[PDB]
Design a protein around this ligand. Structure first.
Ligand code: MG
Ligand code: MG
Ligand code: ZN
Lengths: 34, 1236, 96, 55, 100, 347
RNA sequence: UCCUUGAUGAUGUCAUACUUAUCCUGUCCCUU
RNA sequence: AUCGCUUCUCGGCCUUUUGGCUAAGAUCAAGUGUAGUAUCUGUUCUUUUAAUAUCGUCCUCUACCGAGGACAAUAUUAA
C-alpha cells in the first residue's frame, strides 16, 4: 500500500552529487602485490 | 539562418532603444482613418465566440482538419508530432471539452511558450518556417476559422483584398484584363490621355507592424479579449539551437491567424493609399456593395484618376487614367521636387526585356516622367515607418500616343494588352496564347492580351526541379517521377496557355525533363551512350512503368514498335503503325489540358446547364443519376463534381482559405505547387485519361508495351486483372526504423529492384549498353553491363540450380513421351545420355540430349522448322537420331526463337567443337524469359506432329517451369484474380462423362461446430463429427470418410488445418487404392482445396485438379437421416461405400442419373420438408435398405423430376422476386445445374 | 504523454543536470527525466529555476514600473519582463 | 607471365588469370582479401591491351 | 534517482571503457603466463617461446638511442657507479615503482 | 508437428502466407565452399540438398518474401561500404551466402510462425468483440444465428437507425479469404436485409473495410440503411470519394467496378480492398496501398457526411448504456421477424 | 631411514530466472 | 628570546586541470517475447530383439603390389 504524504528530508541536488561521487565506476583497482 | 537571427536580434534591440518609428501623429492618422472607414461601412464588431454558438463544432472540425493536413505526407514523427496528433484526436473525440479549453485560453492566457524557427531553402531566397506549441496551435487554428467566418459575414474586407475564395489567380488576371477593357474610352489618346500601370509591393509590411497600434486596430475590429490574445501571441521568444530573442516589433507569420492580421493591416494601408473617398467609391454603398472591378456609375468611374486597384497579399496593382492637364500638373510637381537637367530619367528606367524590341515600352520623356511622377505620388502617401515602396522592385508602364502597349505582371505570369485601334495593322486570331477580350457594351473584340510566364516563376520551377534532384530519397525512381509529375502539373495547370507562348520556359521544360531522365539512367548507370528505351519512362504506372508525364518533343524509335505471340499455328509477328511514318512522338501535355479562356467560357455554361438539369429533374421527381451528371462531371469554376464532396455542409464555414493555403508556407516545411487551389472547394481541375490512353496507343498498344517486359515470363493469360503490390517489400518496419542515413548508400537501389526486374528484357540489351557482356553464373543469361540490382533478382529466381533442373526435367519429359509412342514409329529403344551436367549453361557447344535407335532406316526429310508443313526427302542414316534442348533467356533485340533455332543448328552441326552422333538430328530451343519454343532439324515422318503436341503440353505442365514462373511472379509481386487455371465453369460439364476416372471431392462438412451457452451465458463452440464426400460422376461410387472429433485435439479455435487433414486423407486414399482405379481428374467444389491436394498429389503427377465455378449441392447429401445417423453416432474414423445411382443405370444414362441426383440434392438443399413430402407421398411406396431413394418406374421418375424442378425454380424466383414463366432455357439450366 | 506537474525530485535532478551539462544541452537533460521533454526542461529552468528569477515579494517601485509599462506596452509581457526583472508569468499574474 | 608474376609476388594466391586474360577469384574472398587484391587502372588496362592482342 | 546518480557519475566513453577492461585482461593474462613460466622454471623445463616484432626487444638489450655525454676539461674515465642491490627475497613490483 | 504448450494447452504450429493459406510447420560463419577447382559451382549453402519436387513443395508452401531475409542481415553494421565499381551491392549479396547455424533458419522460422503469430492471434481473439468465447463480447446485440455466420448490432451509438452487421463465427479477416459456403450464407442475410429495408422504404449500403492482412482483425460486413432519397445519390458520393482517396499517382487504377464481376473474382486473395455494395447491385472496390492516407473507417465517413452526422459517430464511437440503450435489438427483432430465414419453427 | 615411481575416468548436471546481433511493433486503455 | 620535535590554523605554488574542427556536426522514441547464459540446488559412477554402416580364402584385370566382386559374423539401442 502506497501512501502520498509530504516528506521531511526533501532531497536536493548536492545530495545527488554527494551520492554520485561514491559510485566509483571509473576508479580501476590497483594491480595486486606481485 | 544564423546570420539572419544575428541581424534580427540587432533589429529588435534597435527598436527597443530607438523608440517607436511610427511618430504618434502618424499613428493617430492611421487610427482615425480606420475609425472613419469602419463607421463609414457601418461595421459590426466581432464578439467573443459565444457559449452556445451553433457553428462552433464546424469551425473546430475545419481547424483540426487543417492541422492534420500538415503531418500527412511524412511518416517519421518525433514527440511533438505525436502530442499534436494526440491532441487533435482528443479534440475529435470530445469537441466541447476542447472548445471550453480554447475559449479559456482566449480569455486568460497572455504569456506563451517559445516558438522555433528554421528556413525553407528555395535556392534563390529563404522562407521562415515557424514551430508553435500544439495546444496553442489548436487554439490559434480555431481562432483563425472563427475570425474569417465572422469577417466574411460582416463584410470586413472589400473586394479589392484579392486572395478571395471564388477566384483562382488566373481568373484574377482575366478579370483584371477585361476590367481594363471595360473602362469608358480607355484606349482613346486623341485629346491627350494616358494610361498608367503601377505594380509594386509593401516592402517590409510584415516586419514593421507595431504591436501596440496592432492592438489598437484589432480592438477596433474584434472583442478586446480576442485582440489581446492576438497581440500577446505575436510577442514570443524565437529560438534556433542557441539563439533566443523576443519578437517585440514585427509579427510572426507562422501563426494560424496571421493571415487575418496581414490582410487587415493591408486594408488599413489601402485606405492610406486611396483615401476614404475613392475607396468608398470602389466599395460602393454598404446597402448595395458592388463586386470587384465595377463602379455604380460611369460618372463615378471617371471622377478620379485612380480607376482600378487590387491588392494581392503584399503586392499592389493600380490603374490610372489621366487627361493631359492632370498629367502635366503631376509631372510639374515631380520636376519641382526632383529636377532633371541632364535627361537622366531615361537611364534608370527599367523595361521588360522578355518581350521583343517592338513590344517593349518606348522611352519618351513625357512617359518616363509621368511614370516616375505617378510612382512618386503613390510613394509619398506612405510613411516610411509603416511601409515603403521602392523603385527597384516596382514596374510602371505608361500607355500613350507614343506607346501602343502597356505591360503588366500581376500573378506569376506577365501580359500586355493591345487594342485593334492602335498599331496592329493585321487583325489576326490564330494563336492560343492570346486572349480576345471583348467590350461589354458593344460585344466586339477591342483588344488582345498576350500572355508570357514571368522569369521568376520559371526560376521557381527550375529550383523546384533542382530540389527534386537533391533530397536523398531521390534514388527510388517513383519518388523522382511522382515529384516531377506533381511539379509539372502544378506548372501547367497554373499557367495553361501562357506556357506555349513562352519559348524559354518550353526549353527549360525539355532540359529539366532530360535531367531527371539522366538521373534515372545514372541510377541504372546505363552509360553515357544513348538508345536507352524511353518506353520505360512514359509507360503508365499500371503497366509497371514510371507514369512519367511529358512536355517535350521526344520520339520513340521505330525499332521499339515490334512485338509477337506464339499461337497453335506458330509464332506471329505483329507491328504497330508501319506505312511510311515516323509520327510516334509522346502525346505531350498541352493538348490534354484545357486553356483558361475555354474554362471561363465553359463554366458559366455548365453551371447554368446543371441548374436547369436539376430543376427539371426535381419537378419530374427523380434523384439525380450518374449519367446526366457524367455529361458535365469535370467542368466548372468550382468543378460540378464538388457538390458531392464527403462534407459540403461543413465547407460552407471555411472562409479565407486561399490566403490560409498561401500562408501554409510559413507553417509547414513542405512546399506544394498547388498553393493557389484545393480540391475541396475548387475541384480536380485537370483530368488525364485521354492522355494516358493515347500514351498507351503511342507506345504501341498494351501488347506492344508488354513485350519489353517479363510479362511473358510470368505467364498470365491476359493482362487485365493485374494488381501491383507495394506493401510487402523491404521498405518495412526494419527499413522505416533503420536509423542511420548512411544505410541508404549501399542499400539505395533495393527500392528499385522490382522495376529493374520488370523491364529487365530492355535494360539488359546489347544495343542499350556497349559492354563486355559476361555470362551470368549457372545460366544462359548474359548480363550486358552492371545494372545495380538485376543480378540479385536473377540469382534469387534461379536459386538452387534451376537451369539444370529445368533442362533435365524437359529431357525426362520428352523421353517419357518417347517412352510411350514406340509402336507407332520405327524404334528399338530411346536412351538418355549421361553427359557432364555443365551443358545447360554452355552456349558455344552442346552434345546430345537423347539418342534414338531406329529399326531399319529413316528417309528423314531435310532441316526445317517445327512450324513447317511439307517436303519429305533425302538419305536414311540408320540407327541414329539425336535431339538437343537449348534454353535461352531472350531480350527485346533477340527473342525470335525460330531464327535462334536455325542459327544454332547451322553453327553446331558445321563445326568441330560440338560433335553429334549422326548428321540427322534436331535441337529444340526454349526461351525461358518469353515462354517461346521452336525447333530446327531433320524431321523423320510422324515425329513433327508428335513433337509439336508434346512441347505444347510440356510448356504448360512442367513442374520445373512452374517453379520458374512462380519465382518470377514472386519477385515481381504481381497478382491476378480473373485468370486462373481454367475451371469447369460452364461449358466443360459435357467432359464430365468421358471414359476417364473423375472425382468430386467435398470437404464442406469436415469442420462442423455446434454452439451452446454456458453458466456465464457466454456461448462456446464444440465440434461434431464431420465427413469427406467423394463422388464418382461416371459410375456413382461414393467414398464417405468420417472425420472424428479426436483429430481436432490440438487447435480447436479457428481450426485451419482441416483443409490439410482432408488433403492428407485423400492422398492416403489414393495411396492405398491400386493404379487401375486412380483418378485422371479431381474436381473440387471449394477452391481452397486446390493448393493442398496439389501438394499431397506431387507423388501422382498425372492427376489434373480443377476448380468449379459451377457449384454443386453435395453438402445436402449429408442432410439425409441415414448419413447423419451414420456420422453423428460414430466414434471411429471409417470409410463407408455407397451408390447414389441406386438402380438407375439399368435404364438410365449416367448423365440423366447425375442430373436427377443434382435435382434431388438441390431440392433437399432448398425445399427440405417439402422435398421429403413430395418424394415420399405414399406409405405403399417403399425404399430398399441397400439403396437411398425409392423404387419408381421411369414415368414416375419423370413426374418427380418435373416436381423437384418446380421446387427449385419457384424458390429461386421467390428469393429473387422474378417470374419463372419468362425464363429462357439457358437461364433455367444455369438456375438448376449450377449458378449464373 | 510528456509533462504534467513538476515535483521536487525532477527539479533537483534538473538542477544537477544543468550543473553537469549546461544551459545549451537540453535533450541530454531531458533524457535524464522521463515524462518531460527538452522544451519543458528549458522552460522550467528559465521560469522557476534560474537564480536570477526574483521569487521575493514585489516592492513598491517594481509595481509602479509594472503599471507604467503595462499601460505603456499593452499585453507585451515578454518585452515588459526583462525591464522590471521578473518572469513574464509572474509579471502578468501580479498585474492581474 | 608478367601479370601472374605480379599476382604471385603480391601473395594473391586466391586469384587466377586465365589464358584469355580474365581475372577471377578461385574462392569466395573475405573483406581483407578483397581490400588487398583490388587492382587499379594500370594492371587492368594492361590486361585488356593484352586481351586485344591475344584476340 | 538511480539513473540520475549513475549518469552524473560517468565521464568515459566506449573506447576508454574497453581499454580499461583490456588493461585488466592484459594484467590477468600476464599473471597467468607468469605463473606458468615460474612453474616451468621451478620444476625445470626449458621450453623457449617466440617473438614476432621489429622493435621492442631493443630496450633491455642495450641503450636505445644512446647519446654519449659530451666530454671536456675534466678526466672522467676512471670513475664508475655501483649497481643496485638485488635482494630478491623482499623486493616487490610495488617497491620498484614507489607508493601510489 | 510442433506443440508449443501455451500455458496448459496444445496449439498446432501453423504459418499463414500473404494469400491467407495456412500451412503446417515442421520441426562463426565459415564461408562454406562456394567453388571447386577454379569454377563457381554453387551460391547458397544448400544448393545441393533441394530436389525438384522439394522445390515445387517449397514454392507452393513458401511465403512471398525471399529477399528480406538476406536484406535484413546485409543491411547491418560492419558490412563494409559499397565503393562503386568492383564491389557493388550485387556482389555484396553474393558474399553473404555463408553457413547458417545448424538449422538456425529452421529455428527462427519456427519461432516466428509459432510464438509470434500465435501471440498476435490470441491477443486479437481474446479482445475481439466477435468470436463468441472472448472477453468483451456484448452477447445481447445478437439477433440472428445461422450455419456459419450471424447478424449482430454495433457496440456503439450506431450511426443510422437500423445499422446492423453480418459477422462470421470465426476470424477470417476477408471475404476473398472466405470459402463459398460462408459467402453464400452472407449473401442470404444480404438478400434478406435488402428486402426488409426496401419494404420499410429505406435503402441499403453494404461496406467491407479490410486493412493490412497482418493485424488479424475479425471480418465484419456492414449494413447501413438510409432513406431512398439519399440512397439514390449514394453511388455518386462513393464514385467521387474513391477516386479522390488514397495516394495520387497510384499503380492499380482506382475504382474497380463490381457491378457485374463481384468481389470474389475482382480482387486477388491477399491484398486489402475496401469494397462497397448498393443494395443488391454491387458497387465499387478499391485496392488499398499506402495504409496511412486511407482511414480505417472511410465508409461511415462518406455515409455520415452525406447524412450530416457529427464525426464522433464514425471514429471511436459513442458508448451507450450497457444494457438499457443497447435494447435497440428489441426494436430490430420485431422488424426482422417476417424476414428471418434461419428457422422454420414458427408454428 | 614413516615405504622407497617408468602412471589408457572423477567431483558433476539440470532447471529456473533474469537480461540479447531476434522479433515482432507503428502502435491504446478505463469511468460523469 | 634562541634551537629542535610534535598537535592546529592559514597564506603563496596548486593552467599539475577541462588536448581541435564542421550544419549547438546531426537526431532524440518503445514494448513484448523469446532465447541464452549463469547461478543455485539436488543427487548420481567405478572395479534378447529392431534400425543404419562396412582380418582370412577364391576368381578376373594391370604393372610381390593395387583395384573390383562373393563368402565367413561384428557394432549400436530397448525389455
Ligand atoms: Mg556516445
Ligand atoms: Mg566509410
Ligand atoms: Zn473474432
Amino acid at each position: 500500500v502506497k501512501n502520498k504524504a509530504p516528506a521531511e528530508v526533501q532531497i536536493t541536488a548536492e545530495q545527488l552529487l554527494r551520492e554520485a561521487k561514491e559510485r566509483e565506476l571509473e576508479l580501476l583497482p590497483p594491480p595486486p602485490q606481485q | 539562418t544564423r546570420l539572419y537571427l544575428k541581424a534580427e536580434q540587432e533589429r529588435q534591440h534597435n527598436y527597443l532603444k530607438d523608440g517607436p518609428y511610427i511618430t504618434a501623429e502618424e499613428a493617430v492618422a492611421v487610427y482615425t482613418t480606420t475609425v472613419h472607414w469602419l463607421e463609414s461601412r457601418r461595421f459590426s464588431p466581432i464578439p467573443f465566440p459565444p457559449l452556445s454558438y451553433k457553428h462552433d463544432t464546424k469551425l473546430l472540425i475545419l481547424a483540426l482538419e487543417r492541422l492534420k493536413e500538415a503531418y500527412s505526407v511524412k511518416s517519421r514523427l518525433n514527440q511533438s508530432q505525436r502530442e499534436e496528433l494526440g491532441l487533435i484526436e482528443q479534440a475529435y473525440d470530445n469537441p466541447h471539452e476542447a472548445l471550453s479549453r480554447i475559449k479559456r485560453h482566449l480569455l486568460t492566457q497572455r504569456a506563451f511558450k517559445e516558438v522555433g524557427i528554421e528556413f525553407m531553402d528555395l535556392y534563390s531566397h529563404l522562407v521562415p518556417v515557424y514551430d508553435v506549441e500544439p495546444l496553442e496551435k489548436i487554439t490559434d487554428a480555431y481562432l483563425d476559422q472563427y475570425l474569417w467566418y465572422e469577417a466574411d459575414k460582416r463584410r470586413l474586407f472589400p473586394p479589392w483584398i484579392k486572395p478571395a475564395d471564388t477566384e483562382p489567380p488566373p481568373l484574377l488576371v482575366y478579370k483584371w484584363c477585361q476590367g481594363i477593357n471595360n473602362l469608358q474610352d480607355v484606349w482613346e489618346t486623341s485629346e491627350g490621355e494616358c494610361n498608367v500601370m503601377l505594380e509594386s509591393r509593401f516592402e517590409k509590411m510584415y516586419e514593421k507592424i507595431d504591436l501596440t497600434l496592432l492592438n489598437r486596430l484589432l480592438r477596433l475590429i474584434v472583442d478586446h479579449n480576442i485582440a489581446d490574445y492576438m497581440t500577446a501571441k505575436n510577442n514570443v521568444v524565437i529560438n534556433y539551437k542557441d539563439m533566443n530573442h523576443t519578437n517585440s516589433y514585427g509579427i510572426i507569420r507562422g501563426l494560424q491567424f496571421a493571415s487575418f492580421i496581414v490582410q487587415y493591416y493591408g486594408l488599413v494601408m489601402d485606405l492610406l493609399v486611396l483615401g476614404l473617398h475613392r475607396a468608398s467609391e470602389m466599395a460602393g454603398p454598404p446597402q448595395m456593395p458592388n463586386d470587384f472591378l465595377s463602379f455604380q456609375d460611369i460618372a463615378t468611374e471617371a471622377a478620379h484618376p485612380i480607376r482600378l486597384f487590387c491588392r494581392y497579399i503584399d503586392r499592389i496593382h493600380i490603374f490610372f487614367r489621366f487627361t493631359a492637364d492632370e498629367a502635366r500638373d503631376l509631372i510639374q510637381r515631380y520636376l519641382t521636387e526632383h529636377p532633371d537637367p541632364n535627361n537622366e530619367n531615361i537611364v534608370g528606367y527599367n523595361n521588360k526585356k522578355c518581350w521583343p524590341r517592338d513590344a517593349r515600352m518606348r522611352l519618351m520623356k513625357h512617359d518616363v516622367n509621368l511614370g516616375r511622377a505617378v510612382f512618386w505620388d503613390i510613394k509619398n502617401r506612405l510613411p516610411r515607418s509603416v511601409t515603403t515602396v521602392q523603385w527597384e522592385n516596382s514596374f510602371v508602364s505608361v500607355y500613350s500616343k507614343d506607346n501602343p502597349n502597356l505591360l503588366f505582371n500581376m500573378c506569376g505570369f506577365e501580359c500586355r494588352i493591345l487594342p485593334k485601334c492602335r498599331t496592329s495593322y493585321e487583325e489576326f486570331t490564330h494563336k492560343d496564347g492570346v486572349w480576345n477580350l471583348q467590350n461589354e457594351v458593344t460585344k466586339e473584340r477591342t483588344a488582345q492580351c498576350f500572355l508570357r510566364v514571368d522569369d521568376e516563376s520559371m526560376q521557381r520551377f527550375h529550383n523546384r526541379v533542382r530540389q527534386i534532384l537533391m533530397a536523398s530519397g531521390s534514388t527510388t525512381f517513383t519518388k523522382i517521377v511522382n515529384k516531377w509529375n506533381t511539379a509539372l502539373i502544378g506548372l501547367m495547370t497554373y499557367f495553361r496557355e501562357a506556357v506555349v507562348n513562352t519559348q524559354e520556359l518550353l526549353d527549360l521544360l525539355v532540359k529539366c525533363e532530360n535531367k531527371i531522365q539522366t538521373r534515372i539512367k545514372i541510377g541504372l548507370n546505363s552509360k553515357m551512350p544513348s538508345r536507352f528505351p524511353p518506353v520505360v519512362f512514359y509507360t503508365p504506372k499500371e503497366l509497371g512503368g514510371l507514369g512519367m508525364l511529358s512536355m517535350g518533343h521526344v520520339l520513340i524509335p521505330q525499332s521499339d514498335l515490334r512485338w509477337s505471340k506464339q499461337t497453335d499455328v506458330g509464332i506471329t509477328h505483329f507491328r504497330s503503325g508501319m506505312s511510311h511514318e515516323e509520327d510516334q512522338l509522346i502525346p505531350n501535355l498541352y493538348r490534354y489540358i484545357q486553356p483558361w479562356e475555354s474554362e471561363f467560357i465553359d463554366s458559366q455554361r455548365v453551371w447554368a446547364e446543371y441548374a436547369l438539369k436539376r430543376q427539371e429533374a426535381i419537378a419530374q421527381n427523380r434523384r439525380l443519376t450518374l449519367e446526366d451528371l457524367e455529361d458535365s462531371w469535370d467542368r466548372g469554376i468550382p468543378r460540378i463534381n464538388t457538390l458531392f464532396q464527403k462534407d459540403r455542409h461543413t465547407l460552407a464555414y471555411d472562409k479565407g482559405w486561399r490566403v490560409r493555403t498561401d500562408f501554409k508556407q510559413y507553417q509547414v516545411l513542405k512546399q506544394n505547387p498547388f498553393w493557389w487551389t484545393h480540391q475541396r472547394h475548387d475541384g480536380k481541375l485537370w483530368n488525364l485519361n485521354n492522355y494516358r490512353t493515347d500514351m498507351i496507343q503511342a507506345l504501341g498498344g498494351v501488347e506492344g508495351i508488354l513485350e519489353h517486359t517479363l510479362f511473358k515470363g510470368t505467364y498470365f493469360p491476359t493482362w487485365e486483372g493485374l494488381f501491383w503490390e507495394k506493401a510487402s517489400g523491404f521498405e518495412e518496419s526494419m527499413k522505416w526504423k533503420k536509423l542511420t542515413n548512411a544505410q541508404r548508400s549501399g542499400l539505395n537501389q533495393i527500392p528499385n529492384r522490382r522495376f529493374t526486374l520488370w523491364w529487365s528484357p530492355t535494360i539488359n540489351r546489347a544495343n542499350v549498353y556497349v559492354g563486355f557482356q559476361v555470362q551470368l553464373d549457372l545460366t544462359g543469361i548474359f548480363m550486358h553491363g552492371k545494372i545495380p540490382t538485376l543480378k540479385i533478382s536473377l540469382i534469387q529466381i534461379f536459386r538452387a540450380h534451376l537451369w539444370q533442373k529445368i533442362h533435365e526435367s524437359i529431357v525426362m519429359d520428352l523421353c517419357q513421351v518417347f517412352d510411350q509412342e514406340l509402336d507407332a514409329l520405327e524404334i528399338e529403344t530411346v536412351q538418355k545420355e549421361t553427359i557432364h551436367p555443365r551443358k545447360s549453361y554452355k552456349m558455344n557447344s552442346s552434345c546430345a540430349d537423347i539418342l534414338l535407335f531406329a529399326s531399319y532406316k529413316w528417309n528423314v526429310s531435310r532441316p526445317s522448322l517445327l512450324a513447317d508443313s511439307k517436303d519429305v526427302m533425302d538419305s536414311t542414316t540408320t540407327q541414329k537420331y539425336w535431339i538437343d534442348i537449348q534454353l535461352r533467356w531472350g531480350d527485346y533485340d533477340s527473342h525470335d526463337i525460330e531464327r535462334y533455332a536455325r542459327a544454332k543448328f547451322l553453327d553446331y552441326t558445321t563445326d568441330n567443337m560440338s560433335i553429334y552422333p549422326s548428321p540427322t538430328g534436331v535441337l529444340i530451343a526454349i526461351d525461358l524469359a518469353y515462354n517461346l519454343h521452336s525447333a530446327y532439324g531433320n524431321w523423320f515422318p510422324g515425329s513433327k506432329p508428335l513433337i509439336q503436341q508434346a512441347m505444347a503440353k510440356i510448356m504448360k505442365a512442367n513442374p520445373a517451369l512452374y517453379v520458374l514462373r512462380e519465382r518470377i511472379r514472386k519477385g515481381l509481386q504481381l497478382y491476378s484474380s480473373e485468370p486462373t487455371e481454367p475451371y469447369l465453369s460452364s461449358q466443360n460439364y459435357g467432359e464430365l462423362f468421358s471414359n476417364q476416372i473423375i472425382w468430386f471431392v467435398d470437404d464442406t462438412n469436415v469442420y462442423r461446430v455446434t454452439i451452446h451457452k454456458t453458466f456465464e451465458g457466454n456461448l462456446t463452440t464444440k465440434p461434431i463429427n464431420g465427413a469427406i464426400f467423394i463422388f464418382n460422376p461416371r459410375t456413382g461410387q461414393l467414398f464417405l470418410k468420417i472425420i472424428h472429433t479426436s483429430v481436432w485435439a490440438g487447435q480447436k479455435r479457428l481450426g485451419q488445418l482441416a483443409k490439410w487433414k482432408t488433403a492428407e486423407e485423400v492422398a492416403a486414399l489414393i495411396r492405398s487404392l491400386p493404379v487401375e482405379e486412380q483418378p485422371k481428374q479431381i474436381i473440387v467444389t471449394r477452391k481452397g482445396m486446390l493448393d493442398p491436394l496439389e501438394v499431397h498429389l506431387l507423388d501422382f503427377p498425372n492427376i489434373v485438379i480443377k476448380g468449379s465455378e459451377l457449384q454443386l449441392p453435395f453438402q445436402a447429401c449429408l442432410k439425409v437421416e441415414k448419413f447423419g445417423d451414420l456420422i453423428l453416432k460414430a466414434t471411429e474414423p471409417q470409410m463407408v461405400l455407397f451408390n447414389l445411382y441406386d438402380d438407375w443405370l439399368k435404364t438410365i444414362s449416367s448423365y440423366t442419373a447425375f442430373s436427377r441426383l443434382i435435382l434431388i440434392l438441390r431440392a433437399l438443399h432448398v425445399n427440405n420438408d417439402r422435398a421429403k413430402v413430395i418424394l415420399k407421398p405414399d406409405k405403399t411406396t417403399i425404399t430398399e435398405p441397400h439403396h437411398i431413394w425409392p423404387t419408381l418406374t421411369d414415368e414416375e421418375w419423370i413426374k418427380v423430376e418435373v416436381q423437384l424442378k418446380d421446387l427449385i425454380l419457384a424458390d429461386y424466383g421467390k428469393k429473387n422476386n422474378v417470374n419463372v414463366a419468362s425464363l429462357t432455357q439457358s437461364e433455367i439450366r444455369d438456375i438448376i445445374l449450377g449458378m449464373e | 504523454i510528456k509533462g504534467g506537474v513538476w515535483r521536487n525530485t525532477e527539479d533537483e535532478i534538473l538542477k544537477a543536470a544543468v550543473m553537469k551539462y549546461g544551459k545549451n544541452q537540453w535533450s541530454r537533460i531531458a533524457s535524464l527525466l522521463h515524462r518531460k521533454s527538452a522544451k519543458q526542461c528549458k522552460a522550467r529552468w528559465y521560469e522557476w529555476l534560474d537564480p536570477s528569477i526574483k521569487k521575493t515579494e514585489w516592492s513598491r517601485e517594481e509595481e509602479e514600473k509594472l503599471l507604467h509599462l503595462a499601460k505603456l506596452m499593452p499585453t507585451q509581457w515578454r518585452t515588459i519582463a526583462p525591464i522590471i526583472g521578473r518572469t513574464a508569468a509572474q509579471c502578468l499574474e501580479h498585474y492581474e | 607471365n608478367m601479370l601472374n608474376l605480379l599476382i604471385h609476388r603480391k601473395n594473391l594466391n586466391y586469384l587466377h588469370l586465365d589464358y584469355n586474360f580474365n581475372l577471377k577469384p578461385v574462392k569466395t574472398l573475405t573483406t581483407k582479401e578483397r581490400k588487398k587484391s583490388r587492382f587499379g587502372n594500370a594492371f587492368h588496362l594492361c590486361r585488356e591491351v593484352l586481351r586485344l592482342t591475344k584476340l | 534517482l538511480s539513473e540520475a546518480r549513475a549518469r552524473l557519475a560517468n565521464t568515459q566513453g566506449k573506447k576508454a571503457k574497453r581499454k580499461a577492461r583490456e588493461k585488466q585482461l592484459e594484467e590477468a593474462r600476464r599473471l597467468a603466463a607468469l605463473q606458468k613460466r615460474r612453474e616451468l622454471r621451478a620444476a625445470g623445463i626449458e621450453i623457449q617461446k617466440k617473438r614476432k616484432r621489429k622493435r621492442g626487444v631493443d630496450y633491455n638489450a642495450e641503450i636505445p638511442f644512446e647519446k654519449k655525454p659530451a666530454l671536456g676539461f675534466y678526466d672522467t674515465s676512471e670513475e664508475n657507479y655501483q649497481a643496485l642491490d638485488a635482494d630478491f627475497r623482499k623486493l616487490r613490483q610495488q617497491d620498484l615503482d614507489g607508493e601510489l | 508437428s510442433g506443440v508449443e504448450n501455451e500455458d496448459q494447452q496444445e496449439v498446432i504450429l501453423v504459418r499463414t502466407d500473404q494469400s491467407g493459406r495456412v500451412w503446417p510447420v515442421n520441426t562463426k560463419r565459415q564461408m562454406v565452399s562456394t567453388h571447386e577447382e577454379r569454377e563457381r559451382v554453387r551460391y547458397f549453402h544448400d544448393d545441393d540438398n533441394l530436389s525438384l519436387n522439394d522445390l515445387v513443395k517449397n514454392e507452393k508452401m513458401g511465403t512471398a518474401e525471399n529477399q528480406n531475409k538476406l536484406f535484413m542481415r546485409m543491411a547491418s553494421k560492419f558490412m563494409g561500404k559499397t565503393d562503386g565499381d568492383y564491389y557493388t551491392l550485387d556482389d555484396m549479396f553474393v558474399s553473404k551466402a555463408a553457413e547458417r547455424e545448424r538449422l538456425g533458419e529452421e529455428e527462427e522460422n519456427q519461432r516466428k510462425k509459432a510464438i509470434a503469430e500465435h501471440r498476435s492471434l490470441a491477443a486479437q481473439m481474446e479482445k475481439c468483440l466477435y468470436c463468441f468465447d472472448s472477453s468483451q463480447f456484448p452477447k445481447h446485440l445478437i439477433v440472428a444465428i445461422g450455419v456459419k455466420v450471424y447478424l449482430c448490432l454495433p457496440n456503439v451509438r450506431s450511426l443510422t437507425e437500423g445499422h446492423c452487421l453480418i459477422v462470421p463465427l470465426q476470424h477470417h479477416r476477408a471475404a476473398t479469404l472466405l470459402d463459398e459456403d460462408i459467402w453464400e450464407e452472407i449473401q442470404m442475410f444480404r438478400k434478406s436485409l435488402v428486402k426488409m429495408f426496401e419494404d420499410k422504404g429505406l435503402d441499403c449500403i453494404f461496406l467491407e473495410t479490410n486493412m493490412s492482412m497482418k493485424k488479424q482483425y475479425h471480418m465484419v460486413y456492414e449494413c447501413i440503411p438510409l432513406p431512398k432519397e439519399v440512397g439514390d445519390m449514394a453511388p455518386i458520393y462513393f464514385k467521387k470519394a474513391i477516386m479522390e482517396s488514397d495516394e495520387e499517382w497510384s499503380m492499380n487504377k482506382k475504382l474497380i467496378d463490381l457491378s457485374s464481376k463481384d468481389i470474389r473474382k475482382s480482387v486477388p486473395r491477399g491484398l486489402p480492398y475496401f469494397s462497397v455494395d448498393f443494395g443488391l447491385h454491387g458497387g465499387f472496390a478499391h485496392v488499398i496501398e499506402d495504409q496511412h492516407k486511407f482511414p480505417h473507417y472511410f465508409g461511415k465517413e462518406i455515409i455520415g457526411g452525406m447524412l450530416d452526422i457529427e464525426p464522433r459517430l464514425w471514429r471511436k464511437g459513442i458508448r451507450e448504456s450497457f444494457e438499457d440503450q443497447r435494447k435497440k435489438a428489441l426494436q430490430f427483432a420485431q422488424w426482422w421477424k417476417p424476414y428471418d430465414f434461419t428457422k422454420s419453427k414458427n408454428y
